[PDB]
Design an enzyme around this catalytic site. Structure first.
Site, short mmCIF file in Angstrom:
data_model
loop_
_atom_site.label_atom_id
_atom_site.label_comp_id
_atom_site.label_asym_id
_atom_site.label_seq_id
_atom_site.Cartn_x
_atom_site.Cartn_y
_atom_site.Cartn_z
CB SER A 1 51.03 7.77 -58.93
OG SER A 1 49.88 8.54 -59.15
CG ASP B 1 45.76 2.91 -62.59
OD1 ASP B 1 46.62 2.79 -63.49
OD2 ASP B 1 45.75 3.87 -61.81
CG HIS C 1 47.99 6.64 -63.24
ND1 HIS C 1 47.60 5.92 -62.13
CD2 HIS C 1 48.74 7.67 -62.77
CE1 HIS C 1 48.10 6.48 -61.04
NE2 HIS C 1 48.79 7.55 -61.40
N1 LIG Z 1 42.38 13.71 -60.13
C1 LIG Z 1 42.28 12.69 -61.15
C2 LIG Z 1 40.86 12.10 -61.10
C3 LIG Z 1 40.63 11.13 -62.23
C4 LIG Z 1 40.39 9.80 -61.94
C5 LIG Z 1 40.19 8.88 -62.96
C6 LIG Z 1 40.22 9.29 -64.29
C7 LIG Z 1 40.46 10.62 -64.58
C8 LIG Z 1 40.66 11.55 -63.56
C9 LIG Z 1 43.31 11.63 -60.86
O1 LIG Z 1 43.43 11.18 -59.72
N2 LIG Z 1 44.07 11.21 -61.86
C10 LIG Z 1 44.05 11.63 -63.26
C11 LIG Z 1 44.91 10.60 -63.98
C12 LIG Z 1 45.78 9.95 -62.91
C13 LIG Z 1 45.07 10.19 -61.58
C14 LIG Z 1 46.10 10.65 -60.61
O2 LIG Z 1 46.40 11.84 -60.51
N3 LIG Z 1 46.66 9.71 -59.85
C15 LIG Z 1 47.70 9.99 -58.89
C16 LIG Z 1 47.20 10.28 -57.50
C17 LIG Z 1 45.91 10.76 -57.30
C18 LIG Z 1 45.49 11.02 -56.00
C19 LIG Z 1 46.37 10.78 -54.95
C20 LIG Z 1 47.64 10.30 -55.22
N4 LIG Z 1 48.03 10.06 -56.47
#
Ligand SMILES: N[C@H](Cc1ccccc1)C(=O)N1CCC[C@H]1C(=O)NCc1ccccn1
Ligand SMILES: *[C@@H]1O[C@H](CO)[C@@H](O)[C@H](O)[C@H]1NC(C)=O
Ligand code: NA
Ligand code: NA
Lengths: 11, 28, 251
Positions: free
Chosen positions: C198, C99, C43
């Site tokens: 991330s 992922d 992602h």
């Molecule tokens: N909040 C969304 C929840 C989600 C999870 C799976 C599919 C769709 C939406 C998320 O974490 N996302 C949406 C897409 C990417 C990810 C993110 O922000 N990741 C980075 C991250 C999240 C939490 C803590 C630290 N980094």
């Protein structure tokens, strides 16, 4: 924000 | 790599970082 | 990283910063797994819902860093990307299943006191260490709070959580290619990854051979450091056959 990085890496 | 996961400034010199012991203590 | 602390110098020498070329900005964390290969979250590179689809030439990786914003002359090394490989079954449509992504560097990076690869787990190390209660360590330059940004790399140690608790914390469908970590509301202590962390590593130090292994990749969450929520991590061992196949074929 971010310090500029050497131009060589942006080439 | 043969040397993976051994940090030059820690494991390689037998020095511990400030919180790695927290991890070890959890491995029961 | 929320509720963490400043990393020590050389504490996480496999930590990588994914850096956007223009505008110059932090994109994600990542990790060094050999002199030519960097591991991150898919992602970080591909997420159509947010119009994200980076190509090799959009990005740089910065290795050996401590300061978030400074150019760390004589210490960090900056590498261009040869090729990006995204897991072919990465599920960006639903739940971020699988992922994971690899980036091959145009040229090998020189190891140093500040630059050194992490190990990937074998089946036995994974089975031994991926247990509820066992703590791993997350590092990154991401936000210090959900709603600001650190001067230097942050570190936090977090316990792996029981799978039913992970499942019951969220409406998102969890899979075997994920695990979750963090403290429970009753546990007092806290901490979590946040935006910008991330793609960075969740590591554990094997008590059997005293080596650091990357068990997880910072993948997803709902907010940052919320009570009753947990961070979710890509299960690196479950996807290692794909990692090996890419490296064997293109290495
Ligand atoms: N909040 C969304 C929840 C989600 C999870 C799976 C599919 C769709 C939406 C998320 O974490 N996302 C949406 C897409 C990417 C990810 C993110 O922000 N990741 C980075 C991250 C999240 C939490 C803590 C630290 N980094
Ligand atoms: C993302 O970028 C590649 C190359 O430009 C493209 O072929 C692909 O269709 C795009 N969308 C994906 C992989 O979902
Ligand atoms: Na649920
Ligand atoms: Na939480």
């Amino acid at each position: 924000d971010f310090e500029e990085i050497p131009e060589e890496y942006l080439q | 790599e043969a040397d993976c996961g051994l940090r030059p400034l820690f494991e390689k010199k037998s020095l511990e970082d400030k919180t790695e012991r927290e991890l070890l203590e959890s491995y029961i | 990283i929320v509720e963490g602390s400043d990393a020590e110098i050389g504490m996480s020498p496999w930590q990588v910063m994914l850096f956007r070329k223009s505008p110059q900005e932090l994109l994600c964390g990542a990790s060094l797994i050999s002199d030519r290969w960097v591991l991150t979250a898919a992602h970080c590179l591909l997420y159509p819902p947010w119009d994200k689809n980076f190509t090799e030439n959009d990005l740089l990786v910065r290795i050996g860093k401590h300061s978030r914003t400074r150019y760390e002359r004589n210490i960090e090394k900056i590498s261009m990307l040869e090729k990006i490989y995204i897991h072919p079954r990465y599920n960006w449509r639903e739940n971020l299943d699988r992922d994971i992504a690899l980036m091959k560097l145009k040229k090998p990076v020189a190891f140093s006191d500040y630059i050194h690869p992490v190990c990937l787990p074998d089946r036995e190390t994974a089975a031994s260490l991926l247990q509820a209660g066992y703590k791993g360590r997350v590092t990154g330059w991401g936000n210090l709070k959900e709603t600001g940004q650190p001067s230097v790399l942050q570190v936090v140690n977090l316990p792996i959580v029981e799978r039913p608790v992970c499942k019951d914390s969220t409406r998102i469908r969890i899979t075997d290619n994920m695990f979750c970590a963090g403290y429970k509301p009753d546990e007092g202590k806290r901490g979590d990854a946040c935006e910008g962390d991330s793609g960075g590593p969740f590591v554990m130090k094997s008590p059997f051979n005293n080596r650091w292994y990357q068990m997880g990749i910072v993948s997803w969450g709902e907010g940052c450091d919320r009570d009753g929520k947990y961070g979710f991590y890509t299960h690196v061992f479950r996807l290692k056959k794909w990692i090996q196949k890419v490296i064997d074929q293109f290495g």
